[PDB]
Every structure is written in structure tokens, then in C-alpha cells.
Design a protein around this ligand. Structure first.
Ligand SMILES: CC(=O)N[C@H]1[C@H](O[C@H]2[C@@H](O)[C@H](O)[C@@H](CO)O[C@@H]2O)O[C@H](CO)[C@@H](O[C@@H]2O[C@H](CO)[C@H](O)[C@H](O)[C@H]2O)[C@@H]1O
Ligand code: CA
Length: 147
């Protein structure tokens, strides 16, 4: 069961998400309020035909927080599996540090090898590295279905 919207004034352009997902541009976003490790959460999206969310742009980043609660922490699809400060996205796109959104003095721990987005007074939203086994919520992202 897809939900379909007319992108722009063009009429044969219908993009679609499965009902619970929400749309922004070319992609669909789902917030998983269950509490699981990073590993499990990405496998959770892997079924759904998705990955953990990847943030390339400030506008994407902005659209995303409109769906989040500030009292919460959500896994990103961004890690450093070997603690070498060599960051990877789960979708195999490049990691451009000139367009990231870490909190001040994050990342701050070679032992913390996943990344969450969360809310800090005044800094607002931003990224922080934490421990994988520590169960958290997650955001998933896939490409929209077209019809
Ligand atoms: C302030 C903050 O981000 N706290 C989270 C904490 O961060 C660590 C650390 O990675 C960070 O660099 C440092 C800088 O001040 O602060 C802390 O030491 O990491 C934990 C998990 O390891 C997060 O806890 C999670 O928070 C959720 C709600 O926001 C929820 O309660 C989860 O159950 C909880 O594990 C901190 O948010
Ligand atoms: Ca950290």
C-alpha cells in the first residue's frame, strides 16, 4: 500500500512511499521507534529495502528533524567500524567532511564507532558518535517508487 503524491505541477509524475513512510524529494523516510543495536537496526532497514539514513545536504538534514523528538537519539547510517576516523555511509557514498553536522567536539572517541543524531540545548540538532551495542532508535531511507 503506497501513498502517492504529485511532484511539481507535472501530472504523470507520481512518487510513492509505503504509508507509514514520509516523503522528501527523491526519497522516503521511516522512523523506527524500537530500541536496537546499530547492527540490528541496519538489518531492520535491509528487509524494508532500505538503509539507515544518509545525510548529504543541509536541507535533507533539516527535513529529517521535523520528524524527530528532541528527547530522543536516532541512529544514522554512518560508522567507523575500526576506530580509525575513516567514516563510512551504509550506501557507499563518499564522506565529505565539509558537509557534515557533528556537534562541537564530536566525534570524540575512537571506541564510539556509530553515529546518532540528537538534540542539545542551543547547538540544536547534530551528530555524535556512541557505542553500537547500546540500543537506540533509527531512521531509514529509501528511494521513492514511481508510477
Ligand atoms: C549528550 C549526549 O549526546 N548524550 C548521549 C551519550 O553521548 C556520550 C558521548 O558519545 C558524547 O560524546 C558525550 C559528549 O557530551 O556525551 C556522552 O558521554 O551517549 C549515550 C549513549 O551512549 C546517549 O544515551 C542515549 O540517549 C537516548 C535519549 O537521548 C536514550 O535515553 C538512550 O537509551 C540512551 O542510551 C546520550 O544521548
Ligand atoms: Ca561521542
Amino acid at each position: 500500500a503506497l501513498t502517492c503524491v504529485m511532484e511539481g505541477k507535472d501530472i504523470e509524475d507520481w512518487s510513492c512511499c509505503p504509508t507509514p513512510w514520509t516523503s522528501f524529494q527523491s526519497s522516503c523516510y521511516f522512523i523506527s521507534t524500537g530500541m536496537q543495536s546499530w547492527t540490528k537496526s541496519q538489518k531492520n532497514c535491509s528487509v524494508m529495502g532500505a538503509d539507515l539514513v544518509v545525510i548529504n545536504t543541509r536541507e535533507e538534514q533539516d527535513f529529517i528533524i521535523q520528524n524527530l523528538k528532541r528527547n530522543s537519539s536516532y541512529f544514522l547510517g554512518l560508522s567507523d567500524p575500526g576506530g580509525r576516523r575513516h567514516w563510512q555511509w551504509v550506501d557507499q557514498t563518499p564522506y565529505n567532511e565539509n558537509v557534515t553536522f557533528w556537534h562541537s567536539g564530536e566525534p570524540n572517541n575512537l571506541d564510539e564507532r556509530c553515529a546518532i543524531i540528537n538534540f542539545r540545548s542551543s547547538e540544536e540538532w547534530g551528530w555524535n558518535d556512541i557505542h553500537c551495542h547500546v540500543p537506540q532508535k533509527s531512521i531509514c531511507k529509501m528511494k521513492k517508487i514511481y508510477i
